[PDB]
Amino acid sequence: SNEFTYSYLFRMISHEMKQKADQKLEQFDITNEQGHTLGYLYAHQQDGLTQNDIAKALQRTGPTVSNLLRNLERKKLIYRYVDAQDTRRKNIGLTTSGIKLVEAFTSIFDEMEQTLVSQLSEEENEQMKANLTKMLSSLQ
Amino acid sequence: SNEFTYSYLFRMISHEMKQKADQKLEQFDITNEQGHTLGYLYAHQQDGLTQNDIAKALQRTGPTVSNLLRNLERKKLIYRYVDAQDTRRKNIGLTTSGIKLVEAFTSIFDEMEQTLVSQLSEEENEQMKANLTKMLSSLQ
Ligand SMILES: CC[n+]1c(-c2ccccc2)c2cc(N)ccc2c2ccc(N)cc21
Ligand SMILES: CC[n+]1c(-c2ccccc2)c2cc(N)ccc2c2ccc(N)cc21
Ligand SMILES: [K+]
Ligand SMILES: [K+]
């Protein structure tokens, strides 16, 4: 409808999506930082990740990353295994519970997006995302 | 672009609009409640508003409204004048500084909206607002 400002519609949609996601998030009890770490591992552990690599990629310091990985390992969401190429070296990866956790978190957003996408045709979705991007561009 | 989720675009646009509005808002130093009161007065003072009317419309109690109007009157943003129809009665309205303040606040959003609207054609804007409303509908 034309009775609403873009500000209102965007505020409400964003608020609602946030509320749903948050209500879904309160049962993980894991840190934002740790969530980002687990997601990075989900996306890149096939590269054989070391602590330093995680530090660089996360743009955090070594001891902070150490703290995170220590806490995640305590929770049994990650583990360290001997490198297949070089048995001298160790790599960090997800455990089963970690993979499950990342997939759940991600499924929340994938389902939300799919819900939104299914309301419009492919062309309508394409036009919508393009106009949204133009608008945001107009906001910077 | 299709590389972004609706969640991202809506979060960013809403965040940005919020940041701009807030940065514009920090120089009024007046309450949210008082802002709403002043806006209601801007929209309806021609009806000859009484304290009770404001209470009903704002869905607040009498003494709370009294507190608000007391503070607004202290700041010289509102005033009480004798009713033209019934000199027995008094009405609440904006002063000059109040009208100016409401117009400034409102101009922030009108300008923001106009900025957003000018990026798209009228048909594009109409389609966009309609799809946004459908989507929000899909979120409730
Ligand atoms: C970095 C995004 N992010 C956030 C997050 C951090 C800050 C603000 C907003 C959301 C997050 C927040 C909570 N509570 C739980 C899990 C995650 C998470 C999990 C995985 C991932 N790949 C990114 C994640
Ligand atoms: C009621 C909207 N609202 C809010 C507001 C309140 C709560 C949350 C968000 C914005 C507001 C917040 C500040 N700081 C200053 C002025 C106003 C305002 C002013 C006029 C109006 N007609 C509505 C107004
Ligand atoms: K790895
Ligand atoms: K009045």
Look at residues B73, B75, B78 and name the one whose alpha carbon lies nearest to residue B45: B78
If one counts every other C-beta atom within 10 angstroms of the C-beta of residue B64, the result is 12
Asked whether the beta carbons of A22 and B32 are under 8 A apart, the reply is no
What number of residues does chain B have? Answer: 140
- Beta-bridged to residue A82, according to DSSP, are A90
Domain that holds residue B65: 1-140
Distance separating alpha carbons of residues B52 and B66, to the nearest angstrom:
9
- Beta-bridged to residue A91, according to DSSP, are A81
Name the amino acid, one letter, at B75.
K
If one counts every other C-beta atom within 10 angstroms of the C-beta of residue B83, the result is 12
Q: Which of B14, B36, B108 to mutate to test the pocket of ligand 2 (most atoms within 8 A of CB)?
A: B36
Residue among B5, B119, B136 minimizing CB distance to A13: B136
Task: Give whole-number Cα distances, B21 to A109, B10, B34, B49, B75, in Å.
Answer: 28, 16, 17, 29, 23
The 3-state secondary structure of A7-33 reads HHHHHHHHHHHHHHHHHHHCCCCCCHH
Kind and range of the H or E element at B103?
helix B96-117
Interface of A with B (CB under 8 A): 1-2, 4-7, 9-18, 20-21, 109, 112-113, 115-117, 119-120, 124-136, 138-140
* Position in ligand 2 atom list of the atom nearest CA B40: 22
Q: In the Cβ-directed half-sphere of B19, how many Cα atoms lie within 13 Å?
A: 8
CATH code of the domain covering residue B134: 1.10.10.10
CB contact under 8 A, A6 and B126: no
Distance separating alpha carbons of residues B6 and A115, to the nearest angstrom:
10
Q: How was this structure determined?
A: X-ray
Which SS3 state, helix, strand or coil, does residue A93 take? strand
* Cβ of A36 less than 6 Å from ligand 1: yes
Total of domains in chain B = 1
CB contact under 8 A, B113 and A6: yes
Q: Which of A27, A31, A33, A36 to mutate to test the pocket of ligand 1 (most atoms within 8 A of CB)?
A: A36
Distance separating alpha carbons of residues B67 and B73, to the nearest angstrom:
10
φ/ψ of residue B93, rounded to 5: -150, 175
